[PDB]
């Protein structure tokens, strides 16, 4: 344990990972139009609670 009141504990002992590949941009011309047509054409409104675009479940 070391001690109760040592600052930066979970910041210090956490693991370290790196980044990934660079993403692109269309200044929202299709960046938000993709989620628009995902919510409109692709995802149907199911009678229930909700169905989000980021729902990875």
């Amino acid at each position: 344990h070391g001690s109760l009141a040592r600052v930066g504990k979970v910041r210090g002992q956490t693991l370290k990972v790196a980044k990934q590949e660079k993403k692109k941009k269309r200044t929202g011309r299709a960046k938000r139009r993709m989620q628009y047509n995902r919510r409109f054409v692709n995802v149907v409104p199911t009678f229930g609670k909700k169905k989000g675009p980021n729902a990875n479940s």
Binding site: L4, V7, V10, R11, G12
Partner: protein, 141 residues
Amino acid sequence: GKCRGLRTARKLRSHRRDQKWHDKQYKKAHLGTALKANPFGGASHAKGIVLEKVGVEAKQPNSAIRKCVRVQLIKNGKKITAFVPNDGCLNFIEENDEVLVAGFGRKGHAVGDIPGVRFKVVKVANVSLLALYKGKKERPR
């Protein structure tokens, strides 16, 4: 209103004056005692000198201990308690350092589970604490 007469207006004006004076926020904002008793003296930010590091206990449902700094102000000359904002930041500062202090955002009241503390630390040793946390800048020697 209730007193409804055509040739009377100073009765309504004096009654509105007394009822507006008999308030809380208007009485705080239009008296010199609230500005005199304010540690900042009516300023958004102020500078002070770090002299003690202490740890206060939190409230009853929320059980932890918070790291806070005793600071003596430059403009006035009285001691306060200031709370360092982010995780792993008490080790970034030491005793006898100049520091920039600001309120939490409750217009001079305690926020959350921390009793007796109404100010927070923004800048220390003329460098931003957020850059010290995120590693964008290296601490002065």
